[PDB]
Swiss-Prot record, chain B:
Cysteines engaged in disulfide bonds, as pairs: none
Family: Belongs to the DAP-DAPL1 family.
Quaternary structure note: Associates with ribosomes; preventing translation. Interacts with eiF5a (eif5a and eif5a2); preventing translation.
Source species of the chain: Danio rerio
Membrane-crossing residue ranges in chain numbering: none
Residue ranges the record marks as coiled coil: none
Gene: dap1b
Range covered out of full length: 88 to 108 of 109
Function in brief: Ribosome-binding protein that promotes ribosome hibernation, a process during which ribosomes are stabilized in an inactive state and preserved from proteasomal degradation. Acts via its association with eiF5a (eif5a and eif5a2) at the polypeptide exit tunnel of the ribosome, preventing mRNA translation. Plays a key role in ribosome hibernation in the mature egg by preventing mRNA translation, leading to ribosome inactivation. Ribosomes, which are produced in large quantities during oogenesis, are stored and translationally repressed in the egg and early embryo.
This protein's name: Death-associated protein-like 1 homolog
UniProtKB/Swiss-Prot annotation, chain E:
Species classification: Eukaryota, Metazoa, Chordata, Craniata, Vertebrata
Pfam families: Ribosomal_L29
Disulfide partners: none
Subunit (UniProt): Component of the large ribosomal subunit.
Protein's UniProt name: Large ribosomal subunit protein uL29
Length: 102, 17, 49, 86, 120, 51
RNA sequence: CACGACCUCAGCUCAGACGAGAAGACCCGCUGAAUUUAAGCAUAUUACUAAGCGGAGGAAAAGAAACCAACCGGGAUUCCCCCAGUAGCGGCGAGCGAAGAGGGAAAAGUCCAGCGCCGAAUCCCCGCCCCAGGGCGAGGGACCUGUGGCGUACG
RNA sequence: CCAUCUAAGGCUAAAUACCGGCACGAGACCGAUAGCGGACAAGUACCGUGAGGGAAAGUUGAAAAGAACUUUGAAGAGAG
RNA sequence: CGGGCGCAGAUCUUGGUGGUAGUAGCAAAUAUUCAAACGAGAGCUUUGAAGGCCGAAGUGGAGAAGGGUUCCAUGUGAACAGCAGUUGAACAUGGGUGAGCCGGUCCUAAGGGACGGGCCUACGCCGUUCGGAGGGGAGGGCCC
RNA sequence: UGAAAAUCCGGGGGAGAAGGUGUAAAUCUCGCGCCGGGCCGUACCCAUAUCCGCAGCAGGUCUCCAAGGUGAACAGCCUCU
RNA sequence: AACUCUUAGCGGUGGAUCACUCGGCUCGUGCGUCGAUGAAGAACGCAGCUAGCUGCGAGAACUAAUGUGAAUUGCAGGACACACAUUGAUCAUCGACCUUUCGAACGCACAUUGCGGCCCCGGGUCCAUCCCGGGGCCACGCCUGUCUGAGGGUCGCC
C-alpha cells in the first residue's frame, strides 16, 4: 500500500487486502480514494479523508495494514506505546522533569 | 589577511658498543 | 579566455561594475564614514573563479 | 614533482556555476551539483552541518512571495474588496 | 498625469497619453548622455512615475472588465480566482462542509443539548 | 537585428541598410545601424539630439 | 469488425481537477552506529539514541475497551503527581526498569460492512429556471459484481 | 470452574508538545578579547577544485562651529 | 543576598612591543656609455649616437586552456611595484571587442542518460539498443 | 589492420505525368534576374612582470611560422629582420 | 664627551582601564500562514549623480487606494507639492494593480540566452508558399467523463 500510494500521489490509500500468494511474490489490492471528486466530497460520511491531516496516511502508520506494526493497543501486552507511539512513550519516560520547587 | 599560526612544513641514534 | 559563454560574460560584467571606486559625494554624505570600498578586488591578488 | 612543479598543470575547470543555487559546485563530468543536489528534484541538506543549513535555509534570502503571505495573514487573506473612498 | 483623472478617460486617449510620455522620456535619456541640465535630468523620475500611473490605470481597468465578464461563469481564469493560499483553496467549501447526512439530521433534531441549570 | 532595424524605422522614420550588434563588456548591447544612402546620419543625429 | 452487447486493455496538447518542491523546533513511519561504561573484553551498556529515508498538522499521534482487576470492583485517549528507582531484566557484573490502583488537568462520544425490508427510493456530469439556499430537463452517465434510507454489540 | 472483553473496518474536539516561523513583554544575565560567528556594507571580506572553513572591525563635540586668512616647501608636513 | 569573583607560569588564548638589528640580505642567464629634453627632484623615464646580448628548437611574430579589463589615451606620484622613478600590469577620469561564408550552433566517438521493465521499506538504483499496442512524416482520391 | 554519424551524390528500378502538330509535362540554372541569412563568442596577456605555485617565484603549462656563414646537422660560435 | 643602568617630568609607540549601548543571550505570552494561481533559494537588473547593504522587478530605490497633513536632504534641485482654495509633500497601513530569467521548473535540452512543433494575429509577400514581429500553447504521474479504437476474451443475431 505504500508502493501504490506513492505512485498515485493524487489519491489517498484507504485499505488493502490479500488476493494471491506464491513462493516468490505476494499479490494485494489497494483501495484508493480521489478526495477531490464531487461524489466523495459531497458525502458527509467520506469528507473525513478529504482533510489535510490525512495526507499520505499509508506511510505514517495510519492504515489498518500499517497501524499493526506500530504495536499499540490497550492492556499489559502494549506497555511500550503508552502515549501514542513507542517514541512518544520513550521520550516521556526519559525526560528529566525538573520541577520549579524540587 | 593570513592565519595566526601555520603548520610548519633524521638521526636513528642508537649507540651500540 | 576569448571563447566565453553568455552566462560567464554576464558574470564578469557584474564583477567589473562592482569593482568601481566609491563615489566622491558618498564620502561627504556619510561624513567620511565610508571612505573606501571594502570589496575592491585586484586581478592579480583576488580571483573570482 | 608533487608540489610547485605540479600546481602549474591546473588549467581545467572541474566545477561550474549551478542553475539552482548559483554556486560553483556543478560537477561537469558527473553532471551533478555538489551543494544543492541538482538536477535531483530534492535539494540536499544534512543535519550533520548546522552552519551549512543556516546559510541556505528559508529566510536567508528575499522571501518575495512569502513576506506577502505574512502581511496578508494578519488581516485574514482579504481579497475582492476596496477601502471606503473619500 | 493625475491618479483620479486618468479613470474618466477612455482606452484611446490613455494609450495616446502613454506613448507621448515615452517619447518625452526617450528625449531625456538623449540629454542625459549629451550633458543635459539640472532642470532637465530631474524630470526623468517624474516622467518614469507618470508612465507608471498611466499604465496602472490601464491594467486595473481591463481586469475590472474581465471580472464583470466572467461574473456568473462557472469556469473563470486562474488569475481571477481567489488566491488565498494553496491550503485554503483545497478545503471544503461552505456548501460541502454544511452537508449533514439524513442520520445526524434526525439525531441533531431531537437529541440536541438543551439549556438547563442546577439549583444547588 | 530585426527588432533593432524595425524600431529605428519607427522611432525616427529612417531606413537602415544593416545592423551590427555587439554586447559591451559591461553587459549592454551596442548596435551599429547603417542608414540608407538616401538618408544622412548627420542630419538625423541633429534632429534626435545626439549632437 | 457481417450487425450489435459486454469484458479486458489502450490513445490524445481530449472537458475539468489532483500529486511533485520547501520547511522540518515540536509530530508520525522505518532504518541505525560507534566513541563511552564494564578500570581489559566479546553479551550488556552507550541506544530501540546521532547520522540516513519517507510523510504531515497548528498541533500531530493516540482514542471509545478481544482493558484493568480478583475488589463492596473500576470503565476511551492524552498530560501531571504518585506508584518507583519499585516488580523485574542483567558475564544477576556494570547497569537497566515499566504498570494497575489512588489524587488532579480535560472530558464527547460515534459511523460502516455483515443481517434485509424499501419498485436504485442513490450519486456525478451537462443544459437551465428562481431568492449561500431550493427546483426543472421524454440530456448523458455511474450503479444490481449493490447506491441511498432504517440500523452496529449499550442489542 | 469462575471473572472479563468481543480481535482481524472507519471517524472524533479539549487538556499535551513547540531551540522553525510571525508579533510581543520581561531579566539578581553579557557589556565590544564579553554576549550569537555576526552591536559595524557578517555568513560579509577571505581560503579551498569541491563538500565546507570563516574573520578583524563600536565612541570627535552640546552644536562641524571640521581650522578663514597669512607664511615656508614640488607636496606631504610645519609656524602664526 | 546571588556569583562567569582575585593569576607569573599551562611549548596557555588574543592583541601589542623589544634585544638580535641599520645586522642577514637586495650575488642565476656577458653591459653598459656620452649629450639633450621634460622636471622641485634623474645611474633608472624619453630622444639621438656609441658599444653589446637573444642569434629563426629567439629575450621574435601569432593562438588553445586559464585570467577578466589587466587592452587604449590622458592625469597623479599618497599607498604598492622588497633602491629609485618624471615610469607601470598601481591610482583616477574617459574609451574600446561590429560577421550568412572565423568558431560555437549541427553530427556521434568514448561515454553520460531518459523510455518499457525489473529492483529498493525508501530518497531512488540497475540497465541502453535491447524491451511496450513505442510508428502522428511520405503518397492515390478516402486508401497506404 | 589502424572510427562512427549528420550530410551529399550516382545507378538499378519504370509506378506515374505530359500534348496531339505546336506545343505540353519536366528541366541537376540550363544564361540571368528577385528576396533573406537570426542567436552567442570576438579587446588583451599566452609567459624569466597579465595563467598556476600566498609574489613581477631560476619551477610548471598544448601548438603554428622560422634567415646568412662554418659544419653531416633544427649541435656549438658569429650576423641580418 | 660618548655609551649602559636607575628615578621623575614631557613627548611617542601601543591600546588596556573606566563610562557609555538602536546588540546578544535567557525566560514567558498570543498566533501558528509556503508552493504548478510557479514556492524557498539563486541569477541579472533597477536611483540625475550609486560601489556596497537595504528596498523593489522593464510600472524596478516604487503605482493605485485609505489614514495621516508639510516635507525629502549629502550637494543638487524641483515637485499634476506648497497661499492644501486646480481634494495633498512625507510617512504609515496595505482589500487594487504589477511582479524579468533560472529554480518542484513543465516543448527538447543546458559549460548552448542552443534546437523544435501546433494555433492565431499584423507586415513583407499581395499568385497564402516563404520571411520578420506579437500572443496563446506543447513535461511526468493520476482521477472522473467524453471521443476514437484493439483482442473469437465471453457471447447474441444471422
Ligand atoms: Mg596568479
Ligand atoms: Mg447509514
Ligand atoms: Mg514532500
Ligand atoms: Mg572499557
Ligand atoms: Mg579505562
Ligand atoms: Mg535523525
Ligand atoms: Mg491545542
Ligand atoms: Mg488526529
Ligand atoms: Mg482505565
Ligand atoms: Mg520510596
Ligand atoms: Mg534500555
Ligand atoms: Mg485516527
Ligand atoms: Mg518557539
Ligand atoms: Mg564579538
Ligand atoms: Mg542571532
Ligand atoms: Mg557623536
Ligand atoms: Mg572564572
Ligand atoms: Mg599574564
Ligand atoms: Mg643577479
Ligand atoms: Mg635559447
Ligand atoms: Mg575603466
Ligand atoms: Mg598599458
Ligand atoms: Mg601619462
Ligand atoms: Mg620601491
Ligand atoms: Mg598610464
Ligand atoms: Mg586600476
Ligand atoms: Mg535514375
Ligand atoms: Mg585577438
Ligand atoms: Mg622579473
Ligand atoms: Mg648602577
Ligand atoms: Mg624601566
Ligand atoms: Mg605616556
Ligand atoms: Mg517564474
Ligand atoms: Zn547547485
Amino acid at each position: 500500500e505504500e508502493r501504490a500510494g506513492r505512485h498515485c500521489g493524487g489519491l489517498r490509500v484507504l485499505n488493502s487486502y490479500w488476493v494471491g500468494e506464491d513462493s516468490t511474490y505476494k499479490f494485494f489490492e489497494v483501495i484508493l480514494i480521489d478526495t477531490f471528486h464531487k461524489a466523495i466530497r459531497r458525502n458527509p460520511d467520506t469528507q473525513w479523508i478529504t482533510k489535510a491531516v490525512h495526507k499520505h496516511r499509508e506511510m505514517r502508520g495510519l492504515t489498518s495494514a500499517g497501524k499493526k506494526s506500530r504495536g499499540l493497543g490497550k492492556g499489559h501486552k502494549f506497555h511500550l506505546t503508552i502515549g501514542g507511539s513507542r517514541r512518544a512513550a520513550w521520550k516521556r519516560r526519559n525526560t528529566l522533569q525538573l520541577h520549579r520547587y524540587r | 589577511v593570513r592565519p595566526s599560526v601555520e603548520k610548519p612544513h633524521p638521526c636513528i641514534q642508537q649507540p651500540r658498543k | 579566455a576569448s571563447h566565453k559563454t553568455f552566462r560567464i560574460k554576464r558574470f564578469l560584467a557584474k564583477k567589473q561594475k562592482q569593482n568601481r571606486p566609491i563615489p566622491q559625494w558618498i564620502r561627504m554624505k556619510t561624513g567620511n564614514k565610508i571612505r573606501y570600498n571594502s570589496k575592491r578586488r585586484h586581478w592579480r591578488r583576488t580571483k573570482l573563479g | 614533482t608533487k608540489g610547485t612543479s605540479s600546481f602549474g598543470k591546473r588549467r581545467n575547470k572541474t566545477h561550474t556555476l549551478c542553475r539552482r543555487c548559483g554556486s560553483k559546485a556543478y560537477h561537469l563530468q558527473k553532471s551533478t551539483c555538489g551543494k544543492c543536489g541538482y538536477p535531483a528534484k530534492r535539494k540536499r541538506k544534512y543535519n550533520w552541518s548546522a552552519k551549512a543549513k543556516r546559510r541556505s535555509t528559508t529566510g536567508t534570502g528575499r522571501m518575495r512571495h512569502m513576506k506577502v503571505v505574512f502581511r496578508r495573514f494578519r488581516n485574514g487573506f482579504r481579497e475582492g474588496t476596496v477601502p471606503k473612498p473619500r | 498625469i493625475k491618479a483620479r483623472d486618468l479613470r474618466g478617460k477612455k482606452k484611446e486617449e490613455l494609450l495616446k497619453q502613454l506613448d507621448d510620455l515615452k517619447v518625452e522620456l526617450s528625449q531625456l535619456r538623449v540629454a542625459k548622455v549629451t550633458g543635459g541640465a539640472a532642470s532637465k535630468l530631474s524630470k526623468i523620475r517624474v516622467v518614469r512615475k507618470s508612465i507608471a500611473r498611466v499604465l496602472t490605470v490601464i491594467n486595473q481597468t481591463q481586469k475590472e472588465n474581465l471580472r464583470k465578464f466572467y461574473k456568473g461563469k462557472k469556469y473563470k481564469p486562474l488569475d481571477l480566482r481567489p488566491k488565498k493560499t494553496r491550503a485554503i483553496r483545497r478545503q471544503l467549501t461552505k456548501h460541502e462542509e454544511n452537508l449533514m447526512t439524513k442520520k445526524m439530521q434526525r439525531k441533531s433534531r431531537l437529541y440536541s443539548i438543551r439549556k438547563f441549570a442546577v439549583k444547588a | 537585428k530585426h527588432q533593432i532595424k524595425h524600431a529605428v524605422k519607427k522611432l525616427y522614420d529612417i531606413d537602415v541598410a544593416k545592423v551590427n550588434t555587439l554586447i559591451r563588456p559591461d553587459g549592454e548591447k551596442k548596435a551599429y545601424v547603417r542608414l540608407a544612402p538616401d538618408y544622412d546620419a548627420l542630419d538625423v543625429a541633429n534632429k534626435i539630439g545626439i549632437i
